[PDB]
Scaffold this active site. Structure first.
Site, PDB file in Angstrom:
ATOM      1  N   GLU A  58     -15.772  20.068  -0.666  1.00 51.52           N
ATOM      2  CA  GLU A  58     -16.885  19.578  -1.452  1.00 51.52           C
ATOM      3  C   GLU A  58     -18.160  20.304  -1.051  1.00 51.52           C
ATOM      4  OE1 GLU A  58     -16.422  15.914   0.382  1.00 51.52           O
ATOM      5  OE2 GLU A  58     -15.175  14.974  -1.184  1.00 51.52           O
ATOM      6  N   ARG A 110     -18.829  21.550   2.724  1.00 47.43           N
ATOM      7  CA  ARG A 110     -18.123  20.776   3.739  1.00 47.43           C
ATOM      8  C   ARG A 110     -16.964  21.575   4.327  1.00 47.43           C
ATOM      9  NH1 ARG A 110     -15.097  14.887   2.583  1.00 47.43           N
ATOM     10  NH2 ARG A 110     -13.585  15.044   4.310  1.00 47.43           N
ATOM     11  N   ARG A 114     -17.662   3.862  -3.918  1.00 49.73           N
ATOM     12  CA  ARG A 114     -17.725   5.117  -3.172  1.00 49.73           C
ATOM     13  C   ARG A 114     -18.338   6.201  -4.052  1.00 49.73           C
ATOM     14  NH1 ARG A 114     -14.126   7.947   1.106  1.00 49.73           N
ATOM     15  NH2 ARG A 114     -16.304   8.688   1.265  1.00 49.73           N
ATOM     16  N   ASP A 159      -8.737   6.920  -2.902  1.00 48.01           N
ATOM     17  CA  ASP A 159      -8.991   7.761  -4.083  1.00 48.01           C
ATOM     18  C   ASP A 159      -7.932   7.580  -5.169  1.00 48.01           C
ATOM     19  OD1 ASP A 159     -10.951   8.869  -2.356  1.00 48.01           O
ATOM     20  OD2 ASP A 159     -10.467  10.918  -2.921  1.00 48.01           O
TER      21      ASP A 159
END
Ligand SMILES: [Cl-]
Ligand SMILES: [Cl-]
Lengths: 470, 471
Positions: free
Chosen positions: A326, A342, A26, A51
């Protein structure tokens, strides 16, 4: 006009690991270096796509403009806690890199997040645990010892000091020597390896760091071939009120004009303790004016921002829709810095800084021409010819699908006019990273899956101006 | 053994102003100086009894161990906003002092809270307004201009600088000259007064400071007769996460022994932005090791404190019962520092520091012997014959009534063995401040009402070891 995809980091299939034992990749970052090399960075997410877990920060290099790619180079891979009950959350974690090269020193930086063992960001303590202590000017990382309240410190040569300032015979590996620096944080009493300060469960040593959120940096002086040990830059940029502080992954920039020419800019975002991930995610940049030696936090876009007729601040806000997370950063020729963030409006949100990313203009510009399905994006400055443009890539929607490349003209004003919108990948599409390649060519590294691939396979395409104009 | 009460600061009656036009006095501080002088300080609360409005920080001096008292001296009195619609909340505010003398330099300090115009602590902005900016090594106070986002700064000589760092024609009175420094914060353009940076409503000038919480210090080098202009010590001690930071009023101390001998300790307490006054009030001390020149914050008692099997931190806590608020500080002969903290347990809460007030032991000791009704207290160290004691005064209860003096033996390990408990004032009793006078005799300035007095009249009494020792 547009190449077929070349898979750079290949995920496993149908929930299984790939041939290398890796389920997932990712978080693409793409960098064209001074030598012309392409560096493709990613999270190597071994156990699963989330994550957290056992994750390595990795790159591959291309010396032929993206045609072929060498072996994976692992920048950092912290060792797992071998005694963890749940291996899925059983490792100190690195995730999310930003790459950038200093055009003057040629030093290449990868800046990424770090958490001690646990469920990544969800493993942060519910109450603040102090992570650093400033003693007689010097900043030291704190250790907490089993059954004791006080703050031990990690001082020079990694010698652990007692809360009252006495050297112990405990030592932390602050100068890791193992491949990918897997020994970083190892805890010794004299000659004996006891455990690791990043372990937070079923510990075999007395000490752990604060359950907080950290920012690390590694650098390369040989075009991405080898990398320094990680450098903990957190205390330079993380205010006491900040809960999470992490990068907006992708590729940062170096300002190329104006009074701040030479400044390195890295997108980041924070949360606060009032509303954390529910209502406080707030974009900003950190920056360096000394070629990456020291770092500073700029102000948040949300600091003293007017929202719904009332002011908010990134440290105190609790407003889901006012969040910006982000982001990707671009400098225009007029010196202004643009921050594409974002968020949750369904369309593109853009902030402007006139002081080189330190403070932001009072309004966020929205562009209904570009959809935002609440996913990372990347944007780069480009000249053609010589008219000023920005290329921005993200999901077209309605979900994380149908990757798009958006073309904006930058007016003499600083404003942006969106001209063209072109699909670059049908099907699943998420995070991505754009780069200029030269001679009218551009490259993109992006997240996509097909044929049962686990989230995600990171693939590379090249396109030219004729693709953009469609 | 116990003198009759001498009223030092007299409130009005039946909700009216007193003869001087003052409704209320609150927040006693009592200080025995090197010369023997007794300094008695208070909030002079002009318009009403609440923690806002037009309030002056005032003292009176007694040169005969409390028999006669001189004229009120006003340390600080910020001018009201003459355009405010509601005068009750229409002035920049100072409240709550702590007094202390440096035994080496003889400098006397008064440390107290400050808020810009509004309902005191309730006038703080609901979202953070940054109050200070560091530019090229120097910290400057921020100003906000109507309709503009950026931080103006007050720089050298009071000159206002634009957010992009250019000098303007505006200037702030940073070196006030009027009686009680009532011109502090005045905003000028050239020689024309335009208004004041502490005004927040119906402004006549373009600029105001952050609607935050501040700590100010004034000092006296002539035994309390005159005072310096206020010094803003906030940026030395107030962390970015802190919402309120204010003093625990009364009299602070200077450590007299151990590795930190000479350190000035001032009780304070904070709130955070998570639960503010509902779940985060947390005691600590600020301190100076260079005779009051520079100040530092110690850690909170609540920092990494275990509460019902779970850690809290003062910056993130939301726990009503775990709060500790105004406090009083004492150093023992073994060098330990004890912090007696106003709280919500019903009894005396005490924290202990082994490092001169910087960090606290993991346990808060509770003493069932001494009741705490959720009100300020004072406590002093005392040597008698010469065995080591602490005297602590507060309300005996069940409400803010029946002032008690409590006597504890301090044991060699620092434990407190409560010996005697004697009433010192029937009826209303609230904030108070104890001092050693010498013999040993002891003085106390306290809040009490009788004969319809408004909250509060502050009165003074003396007592001796014989009243203290009473069975
Ligand atoms: Cl361990
Ligand atoms: Cl004004």
């Amino acid at each position: 006009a547009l190449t077929e995809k070349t898979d750079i980091f290949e995920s496993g299939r149908n929930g299984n690991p790939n041939k290398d034992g890796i389920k997932s990749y990712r978080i693409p970052a793409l960098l064209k270096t001074d030598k012309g090399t392409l560096i493709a960075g990613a999270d190597e997410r071994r156990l699963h796509s989330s994550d957290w877990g056992d994750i390595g920060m990795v790159i591959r290099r291309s010396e032929d403009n993206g045609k072929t790619w060498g072996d994976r180079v692992t920048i950092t891979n912290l060792r797992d806690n071998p005694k963890a009950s749940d291996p899925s959350i059983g490792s100190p974690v690195n995730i999310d890199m930003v790459l950038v090269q200093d055009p003057e020193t040629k030093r290449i930086f990868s800046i990424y997040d770090m958490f001690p063992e646990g469920k990544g960001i969800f493993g942060m303590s519910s109450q603040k645990e102090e992570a650093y202590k400033k003693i007689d000017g010097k900043t030291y990382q704190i250790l907490y010892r089993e059954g004791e309240k006080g703050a031990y410190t990690i001082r020079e040569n990694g010698t652990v000091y007692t809360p009252d300032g006495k050297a112990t015979d405990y030592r932390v590996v602050v100068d890791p020597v193992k491949p990918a620096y897997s020994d970083k944080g190892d805890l010794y009493k004299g000659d004996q390896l006891l455990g690791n300060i990043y372990f937070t469960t079923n510990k075999t040593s007395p000490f752990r760091i604060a359950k907080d959120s950290y920012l690390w940096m590694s650098y390369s002086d040989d075009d991405g071939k080898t990398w320094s040990a990680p450098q903990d830059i957190t205390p330079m940029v993380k205010a006491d009120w900040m809960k999470f502080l992490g990068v907006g992954p992708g590729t940062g920039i170096v300002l190329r004009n104006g009074p701040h020419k030479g400044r390195i800019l890295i997108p980041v975002y924070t949360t606060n303790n009032v509303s954390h991930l529910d209502g406080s995610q707030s974009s900003r940049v950190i920056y360096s004016d000394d070629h990456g030696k020291t770092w500073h936090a700029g102000e948040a876009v949300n600091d003293n921002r007017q929202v719904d007729g009332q002011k908010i601040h990134s440290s105190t806000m609790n407003n889901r829709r006012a969040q910006n997370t982000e982001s990707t950063v671009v400098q225009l020729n007029n010196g202004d810095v643009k921050l594409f963030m974002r968020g949750l409006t369904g369309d593109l949100q853009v902030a402007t800084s006139k002081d080189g990313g330190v403070t932001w203009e009072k309004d966020i510009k929205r562009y209904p021409q570009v959809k935002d399905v609440y996913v990372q994006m990347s944007a780069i400055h480009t000249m053609h010819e010589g008219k000023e443009y920005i290329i921005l890539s993200n999901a077209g929607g309605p979900k994380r699908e149908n990757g798009m490349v958006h073309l904006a003209r930058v007016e003499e004003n600083g404003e942006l006019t969106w001209l063209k919108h072109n699909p670059i990948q049908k099907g699943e599409f998420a995070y991505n990273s754009l780069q200029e390649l030269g001679n009218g060519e551009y490259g993109i590294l992006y997240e996509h899956t097909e044929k049962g691939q686990n989230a995600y396979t990171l693939s590379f395409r090249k396109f030219n101006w004729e693709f953009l104009s469609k």
